[PDB]
Amino acid sequence: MQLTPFLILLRKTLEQLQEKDTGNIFSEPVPLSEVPDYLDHIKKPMDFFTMKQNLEAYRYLNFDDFEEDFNLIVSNCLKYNAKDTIFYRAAVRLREQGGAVLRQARRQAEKM
Ligand SMILES: CCOC(=O)Nc1cc(-c2ccc(C)c(NS(C)(=O)=O)c2)nn2c(C)nnc12
């Protein structure tokens, strides 16, 4: 498999995932200034902007590493927030809608 089409695919996939985050709550890192206790149990913060930077730094060279960081966006949010919050439900919805996006993209990658 060749690097350029793979990265093209990840760029598109990231945009597609970002589209699911309609509230844009996962677009940027959790503001430690607004949420001071955040790092106390979240050992690897993640967000779509950071994923973009990792992508263009050639840090995602296979689908799994890409999907791992997406999954962190979701699990960090589920971990930090109580179940009866908008945040927690947004992460569930992202997991759900994101999963379909990722499966389709992976099958595109396996044709390469
Ligand atoms: C007991 C309160 O718990 C929380 O405040 N949790 C969370 C809070 C925020 C959050 C707050 C305030 C602001 C201003 C932002 N800004 S932004 C541009 O990232 O949307 C984000 N994100 N977040 C994410 C993801 N996951 N959990 C949380």
Domain boundaries, the chain: 1-112
What are the structure tokens assigned to 67, written together?
Answer: 């999907």
Please state how this structure was obtained: X-ray
Homologous superfamily, domain 1-112: Bromodomain-like (1.20.920.10)
Do 90 and 34 contact (CB within 8 A), yes or no? Answer: no
- Residue ranges of alpha helices (H) inside the chain are 3-20, 48-56, 63-80, 86-109
Q: Tell me the C-alpha distance between 59 and 46, whole Å.
A: 14
34, 70, 94: residue to mutate for ligand 1 pocket, most atoms within 8 A of CB: 34
Q: Is the CB of 23 under 6 A from ligand 1?
A: no
CB 83 within 8 A of CB 49: no
Tell how far the Cα of 94 is from the centroid of ligand 1, in angstroms: 15
Backbone angles phi, psi at 73, to 5 degrees: -55, -45
Ligand 1 contact via 91 beta carbon (within 6 Å) = no
